[PDB]
Amino acid sequence: MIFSVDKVRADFPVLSREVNGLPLAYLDSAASAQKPSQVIDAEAEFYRHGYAAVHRGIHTLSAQATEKMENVRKRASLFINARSAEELVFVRGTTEGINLVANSWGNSNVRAGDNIIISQMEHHANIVPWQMLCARVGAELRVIPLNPDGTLQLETLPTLFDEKTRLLAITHVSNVLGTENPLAEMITLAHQHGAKVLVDGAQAVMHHPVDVQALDCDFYVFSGHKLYGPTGIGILYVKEALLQEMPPWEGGGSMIATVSLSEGTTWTKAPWRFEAGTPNTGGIIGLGAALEYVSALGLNNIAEYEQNLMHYALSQLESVPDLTLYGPQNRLGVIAFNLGKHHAYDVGSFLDNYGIAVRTGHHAAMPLMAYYNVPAMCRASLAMYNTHEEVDRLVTGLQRIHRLLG
Amino acid sequence: MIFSVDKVRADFPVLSREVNGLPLAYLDSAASAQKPSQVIDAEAEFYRHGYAAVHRGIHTLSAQATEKMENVRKRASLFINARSAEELVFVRGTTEGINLVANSWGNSNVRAGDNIIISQMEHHANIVPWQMLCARVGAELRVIPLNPDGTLQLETLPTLFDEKTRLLAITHVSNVLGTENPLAEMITLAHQHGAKVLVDGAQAVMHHPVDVQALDCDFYVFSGHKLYGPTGIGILYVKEALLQEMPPWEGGGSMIATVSLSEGTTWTKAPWRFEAGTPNTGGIIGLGAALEYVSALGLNNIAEYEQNLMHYALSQLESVPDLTLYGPQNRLGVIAFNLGKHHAYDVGSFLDNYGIAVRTGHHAAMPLMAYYNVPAMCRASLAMYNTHEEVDRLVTGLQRIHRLLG
Ligand SMILES: Cc1ncc(COP(=O)(O)O)c(CN[C@@H](CS)C(=O)O)c1O
Ligand SMILES: Cc1ncc(COP(=O)(O)O)c(CN[C@@H](CS)C(=O)O)c1O
Ligand SMILES: [Cl-]
Ligand SMILES: [Cl-]
Numbered sequence: 160m161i162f163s164v165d166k167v168r169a170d171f172p173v174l175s176r177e178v179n180g181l182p183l184a185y186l187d188s189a190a191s192a193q194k195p196s197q198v199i200d201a202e203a204e205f206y207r208h209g210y211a212a213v214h215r216g217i218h219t220l221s222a223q224a225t226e227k228m229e230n231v232r233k234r235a236s237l238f239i240n241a242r243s244a245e246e247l248v249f250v251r252g253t254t255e256g257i258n259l260v261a262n263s264w265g266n267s268n269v270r271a272g273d274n275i276i277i278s279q280m281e282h283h284a285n286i287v288p289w290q291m292l293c294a295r296v297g298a299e300l301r302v303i304p305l306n307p308d309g310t311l312q313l314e315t316l317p318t319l320f321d322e323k324t325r326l327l328a329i330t331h332v333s334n335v336l337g338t339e340n341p342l343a344e345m346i347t348l349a350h351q352h353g354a355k356v357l358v359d360g361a362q363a364v365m366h367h368p369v370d371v372q373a374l375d376c377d378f379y380v381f382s383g384h385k386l387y388g389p390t391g392i393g394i395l396y397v398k399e400a401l402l403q404e405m406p407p408w409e410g411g412g413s414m415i416a417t418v419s420l421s422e423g424t425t426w427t428k429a430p431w432r433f434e435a436g437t438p439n440t441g442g443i444i445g446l447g448a449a450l451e452y453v454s455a456l457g458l459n460n461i462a463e464y465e466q467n468l469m470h471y472a473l474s475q476l477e478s479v480p481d482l483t484l485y486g487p488q489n490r491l492g493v494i495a496f497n498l499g500k501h502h503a504y505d506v507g508s509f510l511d512n513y514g515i516a517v518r519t520g521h522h523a524a525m526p527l528m529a530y531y532n533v534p535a536m537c538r539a540s541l542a543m544y545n546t547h548e549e550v551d552r553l554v555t556g557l558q559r560i561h562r563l564l565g
Numbered sequence: 566m567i568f569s570v571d572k573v574r575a576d577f578p579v580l581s582r583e584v585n586g587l588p589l590a591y592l593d594s595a596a597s598a599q600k601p602s603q604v605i606d607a608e609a610e611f612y613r614h615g616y617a618a619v620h621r622g623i624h625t626l627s628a629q630a631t632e633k634m635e636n637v638r639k640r641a642s643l644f645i646n647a648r649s650a651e652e653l654v655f656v657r658g659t660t661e662g663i664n665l666v667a668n669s670w671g672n673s674n675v676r677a678g679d680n681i682i683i684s685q686m687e688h689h690a691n692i693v694p695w696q697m698l699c700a701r702v703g704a705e706l707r708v709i710p711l712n713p714d715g716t717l718q719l720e721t722l723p724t725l726f727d728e729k730t731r732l733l734a735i736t737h738v739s740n741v742l743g744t745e746n747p748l749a750e751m752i753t754l755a756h757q758h759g760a761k762v763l764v765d766g767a768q769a770v771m772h773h774p775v776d777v778q779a780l781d782c783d784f785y786v787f788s789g790h791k792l793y794g795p796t797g798i799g800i801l802y803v804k805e806a807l808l809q810e811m812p813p814w815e816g817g818g819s820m821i822a823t824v825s826l827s828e829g830t831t832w833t834k835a836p837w838r839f840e841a842g843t844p845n846t847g848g849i850i851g852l853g854a855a856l857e858y859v860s861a862l863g864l865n866n867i868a869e870y871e872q873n874l875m876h877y878a879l880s881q882l883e884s885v886p887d888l889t890l891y892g893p894q895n896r897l898g899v900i901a902f903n904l905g906k907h908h909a910y911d912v913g914s915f916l917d918n919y920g921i922a923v924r925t926g927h928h929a930a931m932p933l934m935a936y937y938n939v940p941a942m943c944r945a946s947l948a949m950y951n952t953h954e955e956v957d958r959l960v961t962g963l964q965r966i967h968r969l970l971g
Contacts, residue, residue, distance in 0.1 A: 172614065173612075173613060176614060176626075179625065185617075185626075187617065187624065187627070190617070190618035190621050190622055196613070198612075202608075203606075203609045206579075206600050206605045208579060208582060209579070210599055211591075211922070212593065212924075215596050215924060216924040217913070217914075218584075218913065218916075218921075218922040218923065218924075219585065219917055219922070220589070220922060221596070221922070251842070251845065254817035254818065254842025255841075258816060258817070277826075283818040283821055283824050284816075286824060287816030287820075287821060287824065287830055288817065290816070290830055291816050300826070384843060389612075390844065390848065391657075391844075391847060410664060410667075410697050411663070411664070411690040411693050412660065412689040418689050418692060418693065418932065419931065419932065419935070420683075420685065424693055424696055436658050436660025437597060437658050437660070437790060437796060438796065439797025440797075441796045441848075442796065507624065508623075510624075511625055517622070517624065519622065519623070520621075520622075523817075523818035525824040526824065
């Protein structure tokens with residue numbers, strides 16, 4: 160296998176940290192990824208040597224900073240195979256991107272009596288903005304239900320889609336179940352009704368290549384900090400024909416063409432129309448470095464190593480008594496589980512005591528928890544820098560916990 | 566004088582940079598400030614040694630990251646003398662903070678037939694969101710006009726304020742003129758009508774102490790990157806009694822209490838109700854370091870040095886032929902000027918050629934330009950790390966430009 164987990168781990172300084180006296184096993188990348196020194200240092204070097212305002216003054220440092228920013232936009236657009244860099248808007252993250260669509264596109268395209276379709280596995284980020292829109296305009300939020308194995312009940316779609324369905328908002332990969340949804344086919348179906356499709360790609364972009372032209376999605380969102388990048392930065396992709404018709408959301412400097420207190424205000428062109436005020440230039444530089452880092456490893460190399468690691472994990476976990484897994488066998492990135500009747504809060508506390516970082520709780524997916532009739536779950540993320548040894552530590556930990564608490 | 570500009574400059578690595586072969590004179594801090602290595606390194610060290618998700622999992626690194634974040638919120642609240650840390654919301658910047666108020670507070674408190682009052686010196690960030698609100702609800706945007714010297718025509722306020730005035734939105738310090746407005750007295754007047762007051766403090770917080778209890782403003786906004794901090798982070802302060810009644814703006818994870826696809830969704834408490842999705846944790850750590858750095862220098866020490874430098878600049882500039890200054894004599898931070906009939910774009914290009922970074926154009930204040938009947942202006946910011954020598958370089962440059970282009 161062409162991927163070298165030991166060379167990659169050497170790029171991540173936090174991975175040398177110790178917790179409760181033992182070496183850290185960081186199994187919470189789905190909540191946020193650790194960052195390589197290449198990403199950390201690119202941001203710091205920008206601040207140390209080339210920092211200035213962008214899209215404003217035209218002196219040397221400002222000119223060069225603005226070019227660096229727009230170069231990141233180009234690099235990002237190539238990463239997802241968008242047709243044009245101008246189809247990408249810099250946002251704080253997946254959550255802000257979804258909210259931008261819900262307001263700018265939703266407010267002018269969804270009216271009383273209409274319906275929107277989400278799924279029962281959606282993260283709150285891809286639920287709440289649509290509930291807010293549905294309440295603003297008097298529309299109905301319809302829900303694709305789950306099967307026990309964590310896949311979508313695709314047979315229900317004929318009854319959910321009708322001529323008043325304006326949008327399907329759907330996750331690419333579940334943050335709990337690891338399910339990858341059949342986006343291409345669902346998007347074909349939605350387009351046959353005249354619906355647009357927003358894809359929540361927050362848990363997809365780090366696991367394999369993503370091609371928004373091949374998908375034909377109308378909107379796609381993801382967050383930098385889960386793609387081994389800095390916080391406070393993400394990407395919203397919107398098909399150019401939709402984007403150029405969308406009205407601004409936030410108002411302020413840089414997104415205007417002209418401002419008058421007697422004759423009103425006119426807007427600049429997309430995507431800058433959607434970027435009011437000073438951007439997170441530092442985070443944009445760091446995001447560019449993160450894309451370069453991931454592209455240098457090769458997403459198909461990453462996918463190969465992670466799928467191998469996940470198969471090993473699922474195999475070893477069979478030797479844990481009374482373990483319940485949630486989701487399908489072909490899961491990406493995350494393993495969701497409970498141990499016997501012990502509360503997830505407790506299982507995660509013990510694991511933390513062993514130096515093992517997992518997330519416990521509802522994982523911002525309360526409807527998903529409700530479907531499985533549990534209050535909470537434990538979750539282990541298995542990212543490209545995690546190791547078989549870390550997997551063994553988790554398995555052994557769960558065995559100890561079962562024995563001690565049985 | 567207790568401030569040592571040479572020791573301070575030694576903290577700023579970019580200040581050693583060279584531009585067009587000469588030492589950089591960075592006179593554009595009003596657009597964004599350079600950052601000390603204390604700020605740069607605090608963020609980088611966080612990423613290198615303690616990075617994790619906040620307000621989510623409770624394992625060791627996450628617990629410590631969440632505490633660091635909430636400690637910054639506390640430090641920020643003490644910096645502006647807010648009564649409680651829970652009156653501060655983390656935002657992308659001043660612009661996003663104003664938009665949050667315009668939507669969450671504006672949409673439920675400003676109705677058809679109402680009026681809002683801004684001034685003719687406002688930055689677009691404190692104009693456009695109110696124009697958008699006024700168009701959403703059918704309200705009127707009223708304007709306090711300017712005097713020739715760059716002060717507000719305060720005699721007009723009796724005719725602008727009435728019983729339907731819901732909000733005064735007013736800049737603390739102009740980003741062009743350097744005018745500091747009489748906020749305390751204007752806020753007393755506005756409160757007598759039952760109006761609330763949002764203060765745009767983006768150009769105030771780095772120049773002297775700011776005390777929102779003494780001001781009694783209802784909202785106050787500022788940006789981290791102008792306070793020697795990272796990009797992508799800012800602060801919105803809102804009086805607790807107003808904040809706890811405001812509805813959420815963005816929806817998603819972390820701002821909810823419960824989420825149901827059959828029984829709807831309930832919200833968490835302020836300020837977290839206003840912080841949807843993963844925050845800019847990296848920028849928050851860096852902002853905390855920036856507040857500690859500025860507080861260690863002492864804002865009254867900074868104000869003393871800057872006011873001395875500004876007095877020197879205004880004195881030396883008298884020896885530039887055909888220079889027009891805009892604004893009052895007691896200006897803070899920025900000097901706005903034009904040279905003869907030469908376009909500002911050209912004057913700034915020559916200055917850039919001398920290694921001198923100024924901003925030229927409308928400075929996101931087109932109504933202000935209109936009032937002075939010019940298309941554009943040059944602007945020199947004189948921040949706490951700038952020097953008398955840099956001032957001489959600007960004066961000499963403008964003399965050369967006048968001679969060469971006369
Ligand atoms: C499928 C999906 N969609 C949207 C989001 C929100 O991303 P933000 O960067 O917080 O805006 C996430 C967030 N992932 C984390 C944090 S709640 C978790 O599961 O631990 C996600 O998994
Ligand atoms: C008075 C005032 N109010 C709001 C803003 C907007 O801040 P943001 O951080 O871009 O959101 C600014 C922005 N200052 C810069 C950038 S446009 C300038 O004048 O060069 C300002 O001066
Ligand atoms: Cl502007
Ligand atoms: Cl949540």
